[model samples]
Target: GGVPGPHNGLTDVPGVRVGHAGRTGDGWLTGVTVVLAPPGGAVAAVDVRGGGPGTRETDALDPRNLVQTIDAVVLTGGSAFGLDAAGGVAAWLEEQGRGFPVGADPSQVVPVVPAAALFDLGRGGTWRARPDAALGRAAVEAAAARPEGDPVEQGGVGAGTGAVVGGLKGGIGTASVVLDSGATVAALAAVNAAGSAVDPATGVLYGARTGLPGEFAGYGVPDAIGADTHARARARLAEAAEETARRRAGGAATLNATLAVVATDATLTRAQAQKLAGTAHDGLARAVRPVHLLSDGDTVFALSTGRRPLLHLEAGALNEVLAAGADVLTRAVVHAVLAATGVDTPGGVHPSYRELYA
Candidate 1:
């Protein structure tokens, strides 16, 4: 029930910037996404909900860890191989002299870059075509090139280049909310999930119901799907279950996961940031059915830029921010599915929600 910030995306939170670098043609359908905090870094924490997650440096994000801030966060599409992207970002940040200072020598500092990856291998023509350090550096450079408060690019890009959800294309999406307390909370999601974002019986997006006024104006549920179409949608779920089992039997990891970053301008403790991340997962669950599966590697990270102070830390001001976090996250998921366009690849044609329903 809150109002969206200008641009209605994560950049509205001020000091936060987003960038994407990935390949779409020539046997490649994967890329990397970077969320760059301010020069001073941001207080951060993470919550992992999926049973199978591919991540790096997450352990350092623990509240009890030595480092309380992070230079950047990376999301990519090469599964474990994509984790290397974080190193590239760290190298770039080091050049700018940003990181946790370790010694009298400024170069001795180490950048705290946490990263997560989704399984998008072999979706393009070549299975070996995965993200590396260079792509990561490029992504960071892209983020730096953009003007402040620029709107983020969505759809099939970056880490979402090869993303597919419920047999439909998924991609990067973002949303933001300005709370009554003057703090802003925002989310950016790389929506790649094993579950469906739409209801099979109605073709209605689970996330659409959670949007703010006029946010999803033209995206109403389809006028009544035929019985056969309804049955086909239901059948797809069963088929997906079978396919997952077959892949597991063949010793292949399931190719699915959703990665998200939530941020706020308000100052918060590491524990509160962690709680914000946990609540954000509730929004993901609302947007996608059968989430947090054994094969899905869903993960969420929360960051506080400490730009504003909480007006009522002991009252309900923090609660309002937390609630807005979940709401914006849910809206971001819908935006991802809606903005996604179909792609033709060697693996097959990954259709978009618009192509199939709209």
Candidate 2:
């Protein structure tokens, strides 16, 4: 077991800051979230497990690539269209004079900002109203303006504004752990999965069972009524599945995904960081039932600030950090479900876990 960092968020890692920008009403329920690395950037890698994923610049993160660091990582709503937000982030970073230099001119530097997008399209009644370059830029600006030490804002914010999980509302969540080796690992998740986050039989969150002490303090199993409510919700989900099938036959894009970023303060090689990202996906599976479905575009990114060296060069030390990364990520998923608020959108009525169980 490990203790939570002061902020209990990805920002707990030094030199990491998060910012969100999105629209919530008037045919717009999608937005973007930006994770800004330090002034010099951070070593980063990505792992994608879902059958369907919308991402940009993931290939460059290969250990064999020339670039070993990333200026920032963007997570946004709007599916493939939303990936444009990374451009905004890159533009902003360029203005800050931060990026991999490609030419003699100082302004010729290019920011390596990889990005992933989740499907929340048409949920806001306007499929065309998706994240763009401007929104991405605004997110970076928001990150810059955020007050130091502020806990990341959660629940129906940013890329999570229109998030839905198995008919229930979903949103942003984060958690961090302070390892015995003095390193810190944290995760931020935008939960919009096709899978259910709660167990229908027990009416309890699947992820909460393994959470750290006090991390899920107010969450508990629901009463009989809650169980009945869950049954009804399941029925509704079945109906939605039928409808989704019809839409798919008509060539509509899949409507579910969960995006995340896991960051640590420990120094790690690009290959090791990629492994860390793969482990973090284990955490996602723990929290969401039937995850990585054909319709879901689940993606996770791992970042290292390289502020501290490993206590041991042996594989065991890396193993500990990898395990901690998975645990914190699982907790982050539960937090997203717990913090979500019910929403009545044109697409459908999505209830929060608390609204149904609490």
- Which lDDT values do the candidates have, in the order given? 0.85, 0.85
Cα deviation at 271, candidate 1, in Å, is 1.1
List model 2 lDDT by residue over 1-358, tens digit each: 3888997888889888899998988878889999988777899999988888999999999999999788789999989999989889999998998888988988878788899999988776676889999999999999988765568998898898878887788899999999988899999999999888888776678887677777766655353445567777667655555554444333334568889999998899999999999999999999999899888889999999988997645588899889998988899998998898887655546777787666
What residue runs in model 2 are displaced by over 4 Å at the alpha carbon?
218-253
Error of 1 at 158 (Å): 0.7
Which portions of model 1 show Cα errors greater than 4 Å?
218-253, 312-315
- What does candidate 1's lDDT look like per residue over 23-64, in tens digits? 877889899999998888999999999988999888998989
- Candidate 1 pairs with clashing backbones: none
List the RMSD of every prediction in angstroms: 2.9, 2.7
Model 1, position 205: C-alpha lDDT score: 86
